[PDB]
Amino acid sequence: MDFLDRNAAPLNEGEWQRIDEAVVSTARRTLVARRIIDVLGPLGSGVYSIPYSVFSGKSPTGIDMVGENEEFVVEASRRATINLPILYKDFKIMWRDVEADRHLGLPIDVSTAAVAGNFVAVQEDHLIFNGNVELGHDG
Amino acid sequence: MDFLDRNAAPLNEGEWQRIDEAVVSTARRTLVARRIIDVLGPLGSGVYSIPYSVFSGKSPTGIDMVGENEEFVVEASRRATINLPILYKDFKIMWRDVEADRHLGLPIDVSTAAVAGNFVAVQEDHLIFNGNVELGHDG
Secondary structure: OOOOOOOOOOOOHHHHHHHHHHHHHHHHHHOOHHHHOOOOOOOOOOOOEEEEEEOOOOOOOOOOOOOOOOOOOOOOOEEEEEEOOOOOOOOOOOHHHHHHHHHOOOOOOOHHHHHHHHHHHHHHHHHHHHOOOOOOOOO | OOOOOOOOOOOOHHHHHHHHHHHHHHHHHHOOHHHHOOOOOOOOOOOOEEEEEEOOOOOOOOOOOOOOOOOOOOOOOEEEEEEOOOOOOOOOOOHHHHHHHHHHOOOOOOHHHHHHHHHHHHHHHHHHHHOOOOOOOOO
């Protein structure tokens, strides 16, 4: 895999685990959407687009002793398809702080990561509720 | 001896060595008096007072073919005793600086110890030249 090239960073497994926690726990607090919209997946890193059905039509339900009908299907009004954008924000960690951690043991302040996590989750909510014109999404 | 203690102190040997060196090296820099005047002793910590002889007077001296006379004696114009005071100054090494050394690695700020050394050497200098009024010493 290794697009997420965490081997090349200096941060040790503890510093990664604390960055991941400081991201996840900031997402959990910040997001409104995942409180009312259920997650699908995660699908995988490589999936660029999803085909999905629109079930915009109401239809009857079958009720019989035995099952002698076939009209009681659900059929997609259309198979739409949507591309998955990237939401991203970047933060620096100054090299001195890594040196302080690795020698003195004064640990990395991951709040830069948590602030990036917030500025991404805010955009995720903005995309979900308001859509996005230029990606051609709808919300 | 062992009126002092090295062992209940928090310092390791290398810290005692740096403190003592910073003391001796500030004394040598500051003890002008021990350049012009010879040290009697150091006799030891136990010595409290010393008897000494003063030869302020002048006397006749013997010149004879046989040496019959015995008036010609070296008479101490006064014989006296002086008490050795303590010259002292206290320097305080903060617990946080020991903690930073023992964990982080920043060496001890022994500059306080050097400044105590200087204030002692200057008090010895002031004693030798000007004399302490309360002790009734002569400078």
